[PDB]
Amino acid sequence: DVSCSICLDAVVAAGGERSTARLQCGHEFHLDCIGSAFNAKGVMQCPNCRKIEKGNWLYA
């Protein structure tokens, strides 16, 4: 089981509960946790390994 380093809750792959994300570096998060973190910084930086993915993170 993997835990989200942002909220410290378990990230669960099953359907029912909270949406999830898996970064290109392999670290996993809840979708709203990592999305809010990307929004605060404006880049897709992993809060764990600090790697920055060169995606297209847009606000609108």
Annotated binding site for Zn(2+): 4, 7, 25, 27, 30, 33, 46, 49
Stretch of 25-33, 35-43, 52-60 contacting Zn ion, by CB under 5 A:
25-33
HEC string of the chain equals CEECCCCCCEECCCCCCCCEEECCCCCEEEHHHHHHHHHHHCCEECCCCCCEECCCCCCC
Q: How far is the CB of 4 from Zn ion (least distance, A)?
A: 3
Residue 20 identity: T
Q: Using CB under 8 A, pick the residue from 3, 9, 10, 13 that binds a second copy.
A: 13
| Partner in contact with 42, chosen from Zn ion, a second copy, none, beta carbon below 5 to 8 Å by kind | none
